């Protein structure tokens, strides 16, 4: 239920060896606006695959 000995800095860091994050490998670029966006997502301005999808 509870520990008999105090774990160490080492074991704490070992457990956190799998806690690191992953950065996006690359950002996609739109044909028309040339903006940078997530793949399969729309841009901040509202474009997607150069078709002027929702902007309002």
């Amino acid at each position: 239920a509870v520990q008999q000995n105090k774990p160490t800095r080492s074991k704490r860091g070992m457990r956190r060896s799998h806690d690191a994050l992953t950065a996006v490998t690359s950002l996609s670029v739109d044909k028309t606006s040339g903006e940078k966006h997530l793949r399969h997502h729309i841009t901040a301005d509202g474009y997607y695959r150069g078709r002027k999808v929702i902007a309002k």
Binding site: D19, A20, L21, A23, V24, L27, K36, L38
Partner: protein, 110 residues
């Protein structure tokens, strides 16, 4: 030339912020901003504002170029913790630690 920016007494634990800092350590400034923009974590918003401040300081104070900059040093230090009381069952009281962090970013053109 080397430039520095800091965010002291930030409302977040260093452990959470360090996860984001490890993503941009040693990266070009242009690439680091794109990483923080699409990192779904609060610490990314804080770190981005610090990085944006360092870039502005270099341009204004050190007359540096942006395309030649690079994140060369970044670290998060533990700040003062705020003590609070959490009422638990059976009259027992627990102590909350609202931890803070000292965020530091260093950019350079080496």
């Amino acid at each position: 030339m080397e430039t520095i920016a800091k965010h002291r007494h930030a409302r977040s634990s260093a452990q959470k912020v360090r996860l984001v800092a490890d993503l941009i350590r040693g990266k070009k400034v242009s690439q680091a901003l794109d990483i923080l923009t699409y990192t779904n974590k609060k610490a990314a918003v804080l770190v981005k504002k610090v990085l944006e401040s360092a870039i502005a300081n270099a341009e204004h104070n050190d007359g540096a170029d942006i395309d030649d900059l690079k994140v060369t040093k970044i670290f998060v230090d533990e700040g003062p913790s705020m003590k609070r009381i959490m009422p638990r069952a059976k009259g027992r009281a627990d102590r909350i630690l609202k931890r803070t962090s000292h965020i530091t970013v260093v950019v350079s053109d080496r």
